[PDB]
Amino acid sequence: TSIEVNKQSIARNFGVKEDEVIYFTAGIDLSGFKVIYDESTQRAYSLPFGIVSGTTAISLDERAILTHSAGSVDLGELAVSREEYVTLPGSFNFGHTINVKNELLVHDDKKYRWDGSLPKVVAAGSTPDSSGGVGLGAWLSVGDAALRAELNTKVSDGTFPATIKYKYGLPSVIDGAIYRTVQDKLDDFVFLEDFGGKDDAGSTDNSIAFRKAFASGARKIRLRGSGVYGMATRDIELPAKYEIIGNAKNPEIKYLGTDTSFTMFTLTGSGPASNQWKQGGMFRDLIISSDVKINWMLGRHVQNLDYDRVFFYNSATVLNNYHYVNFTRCERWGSAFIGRADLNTIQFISESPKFHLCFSSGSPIDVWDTADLAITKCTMFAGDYAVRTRVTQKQVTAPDLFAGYPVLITCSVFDAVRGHAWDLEGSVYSTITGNLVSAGRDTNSHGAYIKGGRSLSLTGNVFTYCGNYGLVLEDVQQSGFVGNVFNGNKTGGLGTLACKDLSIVGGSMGTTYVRGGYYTQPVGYSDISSNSTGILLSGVAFDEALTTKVYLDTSITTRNKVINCSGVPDTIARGSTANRPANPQASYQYYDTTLGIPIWWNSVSGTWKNAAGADV
Amino acid sequence: TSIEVNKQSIARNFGVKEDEVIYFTAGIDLSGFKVIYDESTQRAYSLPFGIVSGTTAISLDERAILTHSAGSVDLGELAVSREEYVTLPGSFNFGHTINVKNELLVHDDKKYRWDGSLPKVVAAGSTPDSSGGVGLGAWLSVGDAALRAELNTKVSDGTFPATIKYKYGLPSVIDGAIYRTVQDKLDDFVFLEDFGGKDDAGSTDNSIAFRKAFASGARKIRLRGSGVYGMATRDIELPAKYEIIGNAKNPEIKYLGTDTSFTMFTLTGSGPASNQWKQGGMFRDLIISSDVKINWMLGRHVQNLDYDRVFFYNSATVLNNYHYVNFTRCERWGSAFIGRADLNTIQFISESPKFHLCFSSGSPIDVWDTADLAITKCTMFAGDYAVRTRVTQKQVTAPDLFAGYPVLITCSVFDAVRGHAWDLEGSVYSTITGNLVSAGRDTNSHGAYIKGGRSLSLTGNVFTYCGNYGLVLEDVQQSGFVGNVFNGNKTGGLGTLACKDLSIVGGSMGTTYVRGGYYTQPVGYSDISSNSTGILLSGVAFDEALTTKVYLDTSITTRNKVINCSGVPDTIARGSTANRPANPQASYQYYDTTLGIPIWWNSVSGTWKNAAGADV
Amino acid sequence: TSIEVNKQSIARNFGVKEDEVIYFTAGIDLSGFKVIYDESTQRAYSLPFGIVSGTTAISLDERAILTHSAGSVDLGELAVSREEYVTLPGSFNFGHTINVKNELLVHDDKKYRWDGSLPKVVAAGSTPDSSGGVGLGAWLSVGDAALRAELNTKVSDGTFPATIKYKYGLPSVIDGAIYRTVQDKLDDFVFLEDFGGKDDAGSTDNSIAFRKAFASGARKIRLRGSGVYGMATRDIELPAKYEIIGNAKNPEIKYLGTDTSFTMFTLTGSGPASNQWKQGGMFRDLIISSDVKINWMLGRHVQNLDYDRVFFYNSATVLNNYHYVNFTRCERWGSAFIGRADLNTIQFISESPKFHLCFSSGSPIDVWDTADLAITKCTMFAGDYAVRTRVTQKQVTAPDLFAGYPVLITCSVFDAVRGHAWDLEGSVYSTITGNLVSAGRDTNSHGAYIKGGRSLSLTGNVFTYCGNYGLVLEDVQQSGFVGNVFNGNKTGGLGTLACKDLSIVGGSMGTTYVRGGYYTQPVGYSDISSNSTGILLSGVAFDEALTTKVYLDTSITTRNKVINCSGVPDTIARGSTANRPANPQASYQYYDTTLGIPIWWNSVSGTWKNAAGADV
Ligand SMILES: [Cl-]
């Protein structure tokens, strides 16, 4: 009487009543019962709900497919939906045959069911991956052990952020916000740390991190740390339109080696033509440093570079054939700017390095063959010199008489420079306005020295306490110098050597003995070698205590003249009869030293007359 | 014997011994046994531990709430704690009656138990959500299938980031750091990509993304890509204090259509009054472009706008009734600035568009009725003109005599402009300092042209290689011009037309033949139409090779005078007896052309005398 | 029989066939069976696969260790791998003895198994933590309830982001990208919100948030909100090189209290020396505000501070012993700058506060003992005054004659200031170029007032519609004033008091009656108290309608002279015979009022001669 005791045990397993279990036998009414039993396979299954009266059984096969008068039903599938499983003996490794959807095969302490066609044979030595894979239509993991292992794997294998859907502003419903992944959202920013960058002061070679970061296509790179990012691999080529952003000017990009030939970054165009200049980028909010003097960056055939709030230390910037470069709010310590143009084989010219709101100590600006160097609202302290311009090819062919380029220096301060604050050769169409200069004391040098200048304006500047003259002009022609003050300089205020057609107007020269440093300036203006012509002094207020206010040949032939300069005689038209003006205007007065009388040109008589009206 | 075989199967189910299972009937000693059985419901339950001797059973009700001599216990609740469940036949959808806390009802292949008040019937077609919801006191999901679906759902529906607690710096314990969600932390930044923005070169209409981003309340928007963000929907109104940030000047916000009337963005105040001006914002580090010429942005009744490191291409900025606008470090290619004020019906004025550290090619600045337009440390190349100012309405009511506004142009470069670099009408109280101008060669135009000027200063500029005159002043009164250089211009250096009371001081005029371009300038200064009065030339250094140094009527009545200009005689008081000064200063010297002698005014005798001292 | 019905119940439990269950007894062939049963313990276990024929049982102990002729097997271990468990009665709290690896003990409705040595006895009142902990070799949680609780705990306790492995750019394989955690990646940025900051208008004290954020080592802090961040705790000391970034100038950092002595932030160096100055940082893109007037920030012994795109409201910045401070693109409303240097006990000097592209209304700049205050491209409106400089120690010791410092003011606009636009004391080597000034109308004050000035240049400025004089110089020596325009001022254009050796050149004075406001200026230049010497006026274009063009004593001893000023007589050499010049230059012309004739000094004869050449 084995059957009803079997029905009892099955009922206890399924938590149903004893009379709700039935053996499958053909033709029976399946209605009302909740569990059916197969004698051949000795497997039990829950029956689908709502089997109506008169529904009779036809067949029940190895795959737990139950066929009856009303239709068919997969009891294996139903068991799965109800999480009623049988865990088969053995495992994937030793092999087994899967016949039913609710049969589980253990692999590595984890359970899997087959979702594909049945029956399914797994050979000995199989894995779920080795026998059809994991997913719909294949192996599907079941239960606690499998889930725990899978959760641990995906969280720790790096795939999880890509799986997590993200929408900005959730749980709030925001119109237009789209679904992305947490991976993608996080990828919105790139830090050097993402490529192995570390501010561990030389343990990590951050040069490599930069290289790999840029190689990925990234352009805008942030530094997380406040420490030193050591750089040990030279000549990392920057991509076009880079932007490297430090952590609020805290971290350092630093070379720690001893090789002065080391260079951190290169920026390199394909050629000298404008369509070959590589587009530059931004360095900002960081320190660029080296213990030894280096050229930290080398730029060749480049355009549109920016440096903003960068602290440079022993780190010179070298550019050759460069066009439009901004240094803004930078602090330059022992960090020269070196501008060249010899790589421009087309025009041999570079353009517009610009400095604004910068502080410099021991950091010269040295540009050759460069047009429109501009320095505005800057302070420069110490160094051998502050600003230097050079022209490499000085020879010209007629009708050209001179070669040079404009510089624009405005409302800037140049202080305690050891040599010249300004050492300007080939300065043409330059405007130099409202600057303060105090330089050259350490080497007895002029505060500013312009050698080779044409058609420029130097306006409203102050030159004080310089090591020689405040300003010396050598080989400067057709230029204007108005409103400048020349105070307390060692040897003189303003000096000229072999100049032609200059206007020197207003301003003041002398010594005001202001606390903080001055020499007793002995000379006001001097044409030092007495070989300039067309030098015009008008309205200059000279300190009466000046030993020599003006040193200048103002005889009739030199075209040098003085008008209304205090302590200095007005230039009078005078000289021998031979030196009478050839084509004087009407009523022109000339003191004839031969005759010892004033004479006047009479336009009507076409003769010189004395005051009595008689011809001489 | 059905009772002891049932007890055995139950024992095997719970994994206890056979003599540790008991049937419920009143009065029985419950001690020592581990599982109790209910004959009526045919359900088995674990017994609570530590039931001591002499404790006997009293009742066992509908829900396995068991009452005995020591007290009562909820075996259903106990079963839950032990995860010992019964999965009911059928499902939620077919409807069911839930009776016990350890009973599970399947919905969608997932199991749920009821945690609230019992019993409760679920109707056919019900879900956990439709029948009391999911949570404490309600439906609680149970088991593998439910957990897997919930985890899978939660990860992919966007709700997961909000569930993850985040605190900055973990696992390090950082004082003051608070718990947020990963969702909140991620929402700290807004990218255009978050609102469907895509740099797919015209496939996505990013105008919509901008609109929806701003509507959410977002103000500061970043661009992730380095490609082209197409813009196809015109006139997107910006919110107050926007900030749009490109990816290190790599990506383009670009109009790809052919409609020249297209505009990307509008900024619009509520009215003309100062309390109605909409506060502007920042565009930075990006390209704004169009293949056809457009006004990319239209601003009306606006204040405090900024553009920094923006590359403009064929994209004009049009502002009407605007107040304080900054262009810094921008590159303007074929991208005019157009400023108007006719929408200001209160004061009819716009204020302070400012340009600093900008490069411009073919990009004019054209402002009407605008005060304090300022251009500093800028470079402008080509175009029909560089700077133009206009006063739309010129009428004055007496005693007003003139209408105009100041412009401030400082240390800037204007090169190869086709027409005038400066075309300035209604320039009043202007300061123009240390600029370099070379313009007008293509159209035979003056480098700079000021028509209608009052009380301005133009100081220390250089005008070289211009298409006509370097600078022409027409209808300019009571203004100063010191230290300017006028070199190698086609027709002349400096010209005046119908001017009154001007000072022209120092500087220089001529040609220095510097390599790079020049004309042989034929004229220095010319009062071209001989109709100016009170024109004073002092201390100007002229190139002696100049064909015409000065063209000016300096006869006694004109108030025009020259002093210390090289190659030009000092202006002498001269003329007929009829033209003797009416009230001369003491000892006034006058050359009388009628008499042909110099005469001197004696203040004591009140007469003109000759040099011999006789009255004439 | 009891044995085969037990075998049946076991078979139904494991889902195997009845003849596949066998009882353990020594010597029996274990081959073919799938489940073995221990009658002593009344426990059933699955058997390992591949037990071959002729393999006979030897022993089976309490730990379910099975020994047979071929070898041994741990059935408890096998059961775990197959997830076939027995849940023991009771719980951790009541204590139990764990015998088999597949035995589970409940703690707090969650299940655990023992992975360590067996047997394992847990005393009453135990937890998994109290009895060996959780992990390999110890307690391991099992099943649904345990997993759900662990997932919920880990997700909500803040530890989850640290567990999620992250690599930039996944699933794309990017060379050089390294694995990090989601926690670390999120930690790349710091927002004030991360430390409890909230823009809830005074409910949250954000001062504390800043303090704790900075204490963590964070330097760069962002503000998420657009609202008001209330600040209620004074004197938060900033770290070196902070950067506080607002949300596109939307949010306010605001003091909402009523204590006018309140200060938000301090920045404090360790001493007066340069290596002790605390390195400053950046405030940008935000509003700093207060309802009452406060000094929002106090800086002492500091260097290199920046404020960019900051809107100040009632918030004065007070710095003492400060060096290099930038205000760029700022808007200052009722927000003075106060600079002092008395804390510098070494040199008593502060350096270079600089203002660029700023707008100010009612916000004076007040610096004492400060060198190189620089204002460029700025607009200042209203206030009692705009710019004031003072020197604290005015006494000097011979040979020093004066004490002062340079200011550099360039291309800036000063409008409708109630008092002086510039109130400059101790101005030395200053350059003031291309500015527009209209001030003092409310208090009948000069537009600009320099009291105590040496060796400075004031060039190409416009002074219009001022409340008194355009500019008054008191105790100014050896300075230049060229190209300035003085228009429509109430009392006069340019005035001097006790000055010495000044050049006043070109420019223009008068009234041009341009719509927008003017006075009828009555005076051009006036030496108001007739006590200046060496005052030189050259080439100034005066409005002919001026009542007084020049008021100046130009008698021979004063060294004051006028040349080429319209409507003003040239200073000519004249006087009595006794007053003939001692040591005259060659050909010197002198009008002798005694004789009533001009005479000329002949250098050869060493005599004065008349025009006829006879000695007088
Ligand atoms: Cl002589």
Nearest to C468 by CA among C503, C438, C427: C438
B460 interfaces chain A, CB cutoff of 8 Å = yes
8 Å CB contact between B472 and B504: no
**SS3 (DSSP) at A544:** coil
Measure Cα distances from C59 to A525, C30, C68 in Å: 121, 12, 7
A305 interfaces chain B, CB cutoff of 8 Å = no
C611 interfaces chain B, CB cutoff of 8 Å = yes
The DSSP line for C39-96 is TTTTEEEEPPS-PPTT-BEEEE-TT-EEEETTEEEEHHHHHHHTT--EE-SS-TTT-E
Question: What number of residues does chain A have?
Answer: 616
Measure the CA–CA gap between C106 and C92, rounded to whole angstroms.
6
8 Å CB contact between C160 and C136: no
Q: Record the tokens describing residue A65, joined without a space.
A: 């497919």
Cβ distance C157 to B165 less than 8 Å, yes or no, reads: yes
Is residue C575 left, alpha or beta, with left meaning phi > 0 and alpha meaning psi from -120 to 50? left
SS (H, E, C) B150-205: HHHHHHHCCCHHHHCEEECCCCCCCCCCCEEEHHHHHCCCCEHHHHCCCCCCCCCC
Is residue C592 left, alpha or beta, with left meaning phi > 0 and alpha meaning psi from -120 to 50? beta
8 Å CB contact between A493 and A523: yes
**SS3 (DSSP) at B528:** coil
Nearest to B480 by CA among A271, C541, C137, A408: C541
A396 interfaces chain B, CB cutoff of 8 Å = yes
Interface residue of B151, B429, B432, B554 to substitute, partner C, most C CBs within 10 Å: B429
Identify the burial level of B229 via C-beta atoms within 10 angstroms of its C-beta, where 0-12 means exposed, 13-18 middle and 19 or more buried. buried
Is the Cα dihedral C147, C149, C152, C158 positive or negative?
negative
Residue A181's identity, in one-letter code, is T
SS (H, E, C) B31-80: CCCCEEEECCCCEEEECCCCCCCCCEEEEECCCCEEEECCCEEEHHHHHH
Is the Cα dihedral A572, A578, A584, A590 positive or negative?
positive
Strands (E), B483-566: 485-487, 492-497, 500-505, 508-510, 523-527, 533-538, 541-542, 548-551, 561-563
Q: What angle do CA C401, C403, C404 make, to 5 degrees?
A: 140
Which residues 194-233 of C are in CB contact (within 8 Å) with B?
194-196, 208-209, 211-213, 215-216, 222, 224, 226
Strands (E), B405-517: 407-410, 413-417, 422-428, 431-433, 436-439, 448-454, 457-459, 462-464, 469-482, 485-487, 492-497, 500-505, 508-510
Measure the CA–CA gap between B106 and B363, rounded to whole angstroms.
73
Measure the CA–CA gap between C421 and C471, rounded to whole angstroms.
10
Cβ distance B541 to A534 less than 8 Å, yes or no, reads: yes
8 Å CB contact between A416 and A391: no
8 Å CB contact between C476 and A541: no
Bridge partners for B317 per DSSP: B297, B337
Question: What number of residues does chain C have?
Answer: 616
Question: Hunting for tokens 């495992």 — which residue is that?
Answer: A91
Measure the CA–CA gap between B450 and B428, rounded to whole angstroms.
11
The DSSP line for C179-225 is EEEHHHHHTT--BGGGGT---STTSS-HHHHHHHHHHTT--EEE---
Give contacts of B174 with chain C, Cβ < 8 Å.
216
How would you label A515-552 residue by residue, b for 16+ Cβ within 10 Å and e otherwise?
bbebbebbbbbbbbeeebbbbbbbbbbbbeebeebbeb
**SS3 (DSSP) at B548:** strand
Which residue of C lies nearest to A488 if distances are taken between CA atoms? C455
A597 interfaces chain B, CB cutoff of 8 Å = no
**Phi, psi torsion values for A599, nearest 5 degrees:** -130, 155
Residue C71's identity, in one-letter code, is G
Q: Which residues contact C35 (CB under 8 A, 6 or more apart)?
A: C10, C11, C14, C16, C20, C21, C22, C44, C45, C46, C47
Pairing of β C252-255 and β C387-390: unpaired
Q: Say which DSSP state A274 is in.
A: G
C304 interfaces chain A, CB cutoff of 8 Å = yes
Strands (E), A21-91: 21-23, 35-38, 43-46, 57-60, 65-68, 72-74, 86-87
Q: Which residues contact A293 (CB under 8 A, 6 or more apart)?
A: A260, A314, A316, A334
A248 interfaces chain C, CB cutoff of 8 Å = yes
Chain C adjacent subunits, 3+ CB pairs under 8 A: A, B
Q: Which residues contact B497 (CB under 8 A, 6 or more apart)?
A: B472, B473, B474, B475, B527, B528, B529, B531, B532
Measure the CA–CA gap between C288 and C228, rounded to whole angstroms.
10
8 Å CB contact between B539 and A571: no
Measure Cα distances from C329 to C285, C363, C378 in Å: 10, 15, 9
Q: Say which DSSP state C143 is in.
A: S
User: In angstroms, what separates the C-alpha of A5 from chain C's closest C-alpha?
Assistant: 7
Nearest to B364 by CA among B352, B380, B350: B380
Determined by X-ray
Task: Give the largest Cα separation in chain A, rounded.
Answer: 170
Cβ distance C433 to A433 less than 8 Å, yes or no, reads: yes
8 Å CB contact between B299 and B306: no
8 Å CB contact between C287 and C331: no
Measure the CA–CA gap between C170 and C186, rounded to whole angstroms.
16
* Cis peptide leading into residue B399 (ω within 30°): yes
Measure the CA–CA gap between B505 and A503, rounded to whole angstroms.
9
Q: Record the tokens describing residue A119, joined without a space.
A: 């029956």
Helices then strands, counting H and E runs in chain B, come out as: 6, 53
Residue B276 has a CB neighbour count (10 Å cut-off) of 13
**SS3 (DSSP) at B450:** strand
Which residue of C lies nearest to A11 if distances are taken between CA atoms? C12
Is residue C241 left, alpha or beta, with left meaning phi > 0 and alpha meaning psi from -120 to 50? left
CA B274 to centroid of chain Cα atoms: 21
Nearest to B107 by CA among B85, B125, B86, B132: B125
User: In angstroms, what separates the C-alpha of A577 from chain B's closest C-alpha?
Assistant: 18
Q: What angle do CA C306, C307, C309 make, to 5 degrees?
A: 140
Q: Record the tokens describing residue C198, joined without a space.
A: 């909230």
Breaks (C-N over 2.5 A) in chain C follow: none
* Cis peptide leading into residue B364 (ω within 30°): no
- CA-derived radius of gyration, chain A: 47
Interface residue of B104, B148, B282, B503 to substitute, partner C, most C CBs within 10 Å: B503
Cβ distance C377 to B217 less than 8 Å, yes or no, reads: no
Helix axes A144-156, B144-156, angle to 10 degrees: 20
Which residue of A lies nearest to C177 if distances are taken between CA atoms? A195
Measure the CA–CA gap between C139 and A52, rounded to whole angstroms.
50
C162 interfaces chain A, CB cutoff of 8 Å = no
CA of C606 to the centre of ligand 1 (A): 9
Residue C412 has a CB neighbour count (10 Å cut-off) of 28
Is the Cα dihedral A338, B414, A499, A540 positive or negative?
negative
Least CB–CB distance from B411: residue in A46, A433, A561: A433
CA of A509 to the centre of ligand 1 (A): 29
Is residue B502 left, alpha or beta, with left meaning phi > 0 and alpha meaning psi from -120 to 50? beta
Least CB–CB distance from C175: residue in A158, A215, A464: A215
Does C13 carry a binding-site annotation? yes
Which residue of A lies nearest to C431 if distances are taken between CA atoms? A434
Is residue B355 left, alpha or beta, with left meaning phi > 0 and alpha meaning psi from -120 to 50? beta
User: In angstroms, what separates the C-alpha of C158 from chain B's closest C-alpha?
Assistant: 5
Contacts 24+ apart (CB under 8 A), C579-587: C580/C608, C585/A569, C585/A572, C586/A572, C586/A574, C586/A593, C587/A572, C587/A574, C587/A591, C587/A593, C587/A598
Identify the burial level of B537 via C-beta atoms within 10 angstroms of its C-beta, where 0-12 means exposed, 13-18 middle and 19 or more buried. buried
Pairing of β A469-482 and β A448-454: parallel
Is the Cα dihedral A582, A587, A590, A592 positive or negative?
positive
Measure the CA–CA gap between C103 and C113, rounded to whole angstroms.
6
Cβ distance C462 to B613 less than 8 Å, yes or no, reads: no
Strands (E), A269-371: 278-279, 282-328, 331-333, 337-340, 350-356, 359-361, 365-368, 370-371
Strands (E), C406-511: 407-410, 413-417, 422-428, 431-433, 436-439, 448-454, 457-459, 462-464, 469-482, 485-487, 492-497, 500-505, 508-510
Which residue of C lies nearest to B607 if distances are taken between CA atoms? C596
Q: Record the tokens describing residue B505, joined without a space.
A: 């001081």
C561 interfaces chain A, CB cutoff of 8 Å = yes
* Cis peptide leading into residue C119 (ω within 30°): yes
Give contacts of A350 with chain B, Cβ < 8 Å.
none
Measure the CA–CA gap between C449 and C451, rounded to whole angstroms.
6
**Nominal resolution (angstroms):** 2.2
The DSSP line for C449-465 is EEEEEES-EEES-EEES
**Phi, psi torsion values for C42, nearest 5 degrees:** 55, 45
Residue C72's identity, in one-letter code, is S
Q: Which residues contact C159 (CB under 8 A, 6 or more apart)?
A: B170, B171
Q: Record the tokens describing residue A217, joined without a space.
A: 């296509």
CATH number of the A2-82 domain:
3.30.2020.50
The DSSP line for B214-246 is HHTT--EEE---SSEEE--S--EEPPTT-EEE-
Q: Record the tokens describing residue A35, joined without a space.
A: 């569990």
Nearest to A38 by CA among A22, A50, A53: A22
CA A170 to centroid of chain Cα atoms: 35
Least CB–CB distance from C94: residue in B50, B241, B457: B50
Q: Which residues contact C114 (CB under 8 A, 6 or more apart)?
A: C98, C101, C103, C105, C120, C138, C139, C140
Q: Say which DSSP state B10 is in.
A: H
First to last CA, chain C: 170
Identify the burial level of A583 via C-beta atoms within 10 angstroms of its C-beta, where 0-12 means exposed, 13-18 middle and 19 or more buried. exposed
Q: Record the tokens describing residue A265, joined without a space.
A: 């970054």
Pairing of β A96-98 and β A120-122: antiparallel
Measure the CA–CA gap between B305 and A365, rounded to whole angstroms.
34
First to last CA, chain B: 169
Helices then strands, counting H and E runs in chain C, come out as: 6, 53
User: In angstroms, what separates the C-alpha of A318 from chain B's closest C-alpha?
Assistant: 21
Nearest to B362 by CA among B387, B333, B339: B333
Q: Please report which helix (H) or strand (E) contains residue A107, including its range.
A: strand A103-107
Q: Record the tokens describing residue C380, joined without a space.
A: 């200042």
**SS3 (DSSP) at A212:** helix
**SS3 (DSSP) at B209:** helix
Measure the CA–CA gap between A445 and C261, rounded to whole angstroms.
52
Nearest to B307 by CA among B323, B329, B322: B329
User: In angstroms, what separates the C-alpha of C110 from chain B's closest C-alpha?
Assistant: 7
Q: Say which DSSP state A528 is in.
A: T
8 Å CB contact between A455 and A489: no
Interface residue of C396, C405, C431 to substitute, partner A, most A CBs within 10 Å: C431
8 Å CB contact between B42 and A17: yes
Residue B430 CA neighbour count, 13 Å, CB half:
32
Nearest to B363 by CA among B315, B294, B298, B433: B315
Identify the burial level of A398 via C-beta atoms within 10 angstroms of its C-beta, where 0-12 means exposed, 13-18 middle and 19 or more buried. exposed
Q: Please report which helix (H) or strand (E) contains residue A601, including its range.
A: strand A597-602
Q: Record the tokens describing residue A110, joined without a space.
A: 């984890």
Percentages of chain B per state (helix, strand, coil), in multiples of 5: 10, 45, 45
A109 interfaces chain B, CB cutoff of 8 Å = no
Which residue of C lies nearest to B84 if distances are taken between CA atoms? C87
8 Å CB contact between B556 and B579: yes
A408 interfaces chain C, CB cutoff of 8 Å = no
Give contacts of B553 with chain A, Cβ < 8 Å.
none
Residue C478's identity, in one-letter code, is Q
Q: Record the tokens describing residue C131, joined without a space.
A: 């009895």
Nearest to C428 by CA among C388, C371, C470: C371
8 Å CB contact between C66 and C75: yes
A306 interfaces chain B, CB cutoff of 8 Å = yes
